């Protein structure tokens, strides 16, 4: 990944 969140 590499992006973040949270969903
Ligand atoms: C998510 O990123 C922030 C910014 O670098 C960190 O401070 C944080 O500790 C990090 O969360 C960890 C723990 C978690 C939420 N269980 C996940 O594994 C994420 C990817 O990494
Ligand atoms: Zn991931």
Buried b (16+ CB within 10 A) or exposed e, 1-7: eeeeeee
**Experimental technique used?**
X-ray
Place of tokens 């590499």: 2
7 Cβ contact list (under 8 Å, min separation 6): none
Ligand 1 centroid from CA 2, angstroms: 11
Token output for 5: 């969140």
Ligand 2 centroid from CA 1, angstroms: 5
C-alpha 4/C-alpha 6 separation (Å) is: 7
C-alpha 7/C-alpha 1 separation (Å) is: 14
Ligand 1 centroid from CA 6, angstroms: 10
Give CA 1 to chain center in angstroms.
7
Token output for 6: 């949270």
4 Cβ contact list (under 8 Å, min separation 6): none
Half-sphere exposure of 5 (CA within 13 A, CB side): 4
């Amino acid at each position: 990944x590499x992006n973040x969140x949270y969903x």
